[PDB]
């Protein structure tokens, strides 16, 4: 159970910067085993984009949580930042706040000033782990 580069290259067939997107995607899914590349429609049935869906390990108050996220890579990735969302399961609820809006969209200085090649997905996830470690984007349903 693993995704080969061939399957990835196919997903980003319509992207403007293919090799760059594939390279970073491989780097991300190798380090973060619970993130998986998925090709799905975004907003319109004709608008297919690849996203990384799954969880990332976030330490909070002495315990590690698998925070559910979805990172949509635009067809202009890595020159434009990904559009990121928290994806709560039925057992949790989104915590609207400083870094999460009403739709679950994530806001971070790293995304706001995103600039290739200094900015990348590995750096973005590292930031998320730190920021969400201070303020979780989701909490369980008590």
């Amino acid at each position: 159970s693993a995704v080969s580069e061939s399957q990835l290259k196919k997903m980003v067939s319509k992207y403007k910067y293919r090799d760059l997107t594939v390279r970073e995607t491989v780097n991300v899914i190798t380090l973060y085993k619970d993130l998986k590349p998925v090709l799905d429609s975004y907003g319109t049935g004709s608008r297919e984009l690849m996203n990384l869906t799954g969880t990332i390990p976030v330490p909070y108050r002495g315990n590690t949580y698998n925070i559910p996220i979805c990172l949509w890579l635009l067809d202009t990735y890595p020159y434009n930042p990904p559009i990121c969302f928290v994806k709560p399961t039925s057992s949790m609820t989104i915590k609207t706040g400083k870094h999460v809006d009403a739709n679950g969209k994530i806001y971070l200085p790293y995304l706001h000033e995103w600039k290739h090649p200094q900015s990348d997905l590995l750096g973005l996830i590292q930031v998320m782990i730190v920021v969400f470690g201070d303020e979780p984007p989701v909490f369980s349903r008590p």
């Binding site: 619970d34 969880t55 909070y60 108050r61 315990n63 949580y65 698998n66 925070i67 559910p68 994806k87 709560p88 399961t89 057992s91 949790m92 979780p136 989701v138 909490f139 369980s140 008590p142």
Partner: peptide, 9 residues
């Protein structure tokens, strides 16, 4: 492996 979240606090 499985999505988890901390309790309110």
């Amino acid at each position: 492996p499985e999505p988890t979240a901390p309790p309110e606090e």
